[PDB]
Amino acid sequence: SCLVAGPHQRHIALSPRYLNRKRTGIREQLDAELLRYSESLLGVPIAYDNIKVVGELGDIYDDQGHIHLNIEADFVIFCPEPGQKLMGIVNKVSSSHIGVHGCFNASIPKPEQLSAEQWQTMEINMGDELEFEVFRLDSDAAGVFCIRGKLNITSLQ
Amino acid sequence: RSNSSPLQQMTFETSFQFLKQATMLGSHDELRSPSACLVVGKVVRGGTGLFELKQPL
Amino acid sequence: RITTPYMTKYERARVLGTRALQIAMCAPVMVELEGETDPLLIAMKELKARKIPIIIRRYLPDGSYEDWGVDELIIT
Amino acid sequence: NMPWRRLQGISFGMYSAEELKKLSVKSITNPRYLDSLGNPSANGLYDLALGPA
């Protein structure tokens, strides 16, 4: 189960426009800008910030107008990681690849299946000629985290 | 020479002797003089810069 | 708790400057401005009404500090 | 949006001579630095790995 919770401290610089309305502004752009976008600091899709609080006070720094402060936030995260056998939606069968929950996109480059199974253009048949186009074995351990629309490269061996 | 600021003391005179000294001694600078504060782009530690403002949340 | 109760002129200058730089960045003005376009005039209007939620953090020469409120400070 | 990070202290010491290495993009060997027409001669003082002048 991808269930994850990570308590992390972030640094956020709030504009003086969001003084009376901080909780509104602490999220408007400074936290809602990487909404479930791959994180490299901890390997995290940021689902949503459940709570964003400040321990005490804010430090306006000399000429700068912004108010800098610290945000202790729990990121509820879905972590499919190496060591897991996940599922995948089978929609389109290709030689290049085989493209969960309608939002997690997964990939399967060519030489990642059992080579005992030979393919036909319209649909592919596996060992015992049993057609499987459904949530089934998908074990991803090589993961892209760079491209805007990231990937989830799944395996079955 | 009896001064605790290498960045000062080299903005005055004989800057290369005071740099050689500060270098062979590992001399540390605290960025509290006006000269050391204007060399590294800080706000001087007197007059208007002597306190914080600490906007409360 | 031991420093002077009044607001030094340098503190007034920096507080006005910071409040003005805040007002100019679209901050709410708690002073009911009356047609003036200068953020510094507005900051003075706010300082005269005792509406500035800033905390002057006076530093002593050994690192120890004292946090005063701009409201709890005798403006001359 | 400024860097936000400030300096507390500056110390002057001597570089190891072995850490200056890896602080070096390439070794220069060609004496004549000015090209026939005024451009940078490769491997000279003015080079295109030591930055665009």
DSSP A30-53: TTTTSTT---TTTT-----EEEEE
Cβ within 8 Å of B, D 3-32? 6-14
Taking alpha carbons only, the member of A71, A136, A86, A60 closest to residue C54 is A60
Cβ-nearest to A60 among C18, C24, C28: C18
Query: Residue with structure tokens 């906007």?
Result: B55
The C-alpha of A142 sits at a distance from chain B's nearest C-alpha, in angstroms, of: 44
Q: How far is A67 from B51, CA to CA, in rounded Å?
A: 16
Between the alpha carbon of residue B38 and those of residues A59, A62, C20, D2, D7, the distances in Å are 22, 15, 25, 18, 12
Taking alpha carbons only, the member of C7, C3, C15, C13 closest to residue C74 is C7
Tokens of C38: 């200068």
Q: How far is C65 from B25, CA to CA, in rounded Å?
A: 33
The angstrom resolution of this structure is 2.8
Determine contact: A73 vs chain B, CB below 8 A.
Answer: no
Distance from the Cα of residue B56 to its chain's centroid: 31
Half-sphere exposure of B23 (CA within 13 A, CB side): 10
Could you tell me if A73 and A10 are in contact, meaning their C-beta atoms sit under 8 angstroms apart?
Answer: yes
The C-alpha of A105 sits at a distance from chain B's nearest C-alpha, in angstroms, of: 41
Q: How far is B27 from A49, CA to CA, in rounded Å?
A: 46
- On chain A, the residues whose CB falls within 8 A of the CB of D4 are 11, 13, 61, 64, 68
Taking alpha carbons only, the member of C68, A154, C50, D11 closest to residue B54 is C68
Could you tell me if A138 and A85 are in contact, meaning their C-beta atoms sit under 8 angstroms apart?
Answer: yes
Neighbours of chain B (3+ CB pairs under 8 A): A, C, D
Interhelix angle C9-24/C39-49, rounded to 10 degrees, is: 120
Q: Which helix or strand (DSSP H or E) is residue C67 part of?
A: strand C65-69
Query: Residue with structure tokens 């600021």?
Result: B5
Taking alpha carbons only, the member of A84, A72, A54, A69 closest to residue A6 is A72
Neighbours of chain D (3+ CB pairs under 8 A): A, B
- On chain C, the residues whose CB falls within 8 A of the CB of B48 are 10, 13-14
- On chain C, the residues whose CB falls within 8 A of the CB of B53 are 14-15, 18, 54-57
Taking alpha carbons only, the member of A127, A112, A120, A114 closest to residue A93 is A120
DSSP states along chain A: --EEEEEEEEEEEE-GGGSSSHHHHHHHTTTTTSTT---TTTT-----EEEEE-SS--EE-TT--SEEEEEEEEEEEE---SS--B------B-SS-B--TTT---B--GGGS-TT--B-SSSB--TTS----SS--B---B---SSSS---B----
Q: How far is A40 from B9, CA to CA, in rounded Å?
A: 45
Q: Given the DSSP bridges, would you call strands B28-29 and A67-78 parallel, antiparallel or unpaired?
A: unpaired
Query: Are chains B and A touching, using the cut-off of 8 Å on CB pairs and a minimum of 3 such pairs?
Result: yes
**Any idea what DSSP says for residue B51?**
E
Tokens of A36: 């479930």
Could you tell me if A106 and A99 are in contact, meaning their C-beta atoms sit under 8 angstroms apart?
Answer: yes
- On chain D, the residues whose CB falls within 8 A of the CB of A66 are 1
Query: Residue with structure tokens 């010491």?
Result: D13
Determine contact: B47 vs chain C, CB below 8 A.
Answer: yes
Elucidation technique: cryo-EM
3-class SS of residue C18:
helix
Greatest extent of chain D over all pairs of C-alpha atoms, in Å: 48
Q: Taken in order A116, A121, A125, A131, is the CA torsion positive or negative?
A: positive
> Phi and psi for A52 in degrees, rounded to 5?
-130, 105
Residue C14 makes CB contacts below 8 A (sequence gap 6+) with: B48, B49, B51, B53
Tokens of C16: 């006005």
Q: How many CB atoms lie within 10 A of CB A102?
A: 6
Q: How far is A111 from B17, CA to CA, in rounded Å?
A: 68
For chain C, list the domains and their CATH numbers.
1-76 (3.90.940.10)
Determine contact: A50 vs chain C, CB below 8 A.
Answer: no
Binary contact (A58, B55; C-beta < 8 A): yes
Distance from the Cα of residue A8 to its chain's centroid: 17
Query: Residue with structure tokens 């036909």?
Result: A120
With CA atoms as reference, the chain A residue closest to B44 would be: A62
Could you tell me if D43 and D28 are in contact, meaning their C-beta atoms sit under 8 angstroms apart?
Answer: yes
Q: What angle do CA A22, A28, A30 make, to 5 degrees?
A: 90
With CA atoms as reference, the chain A residue closest to B57 would be: A57
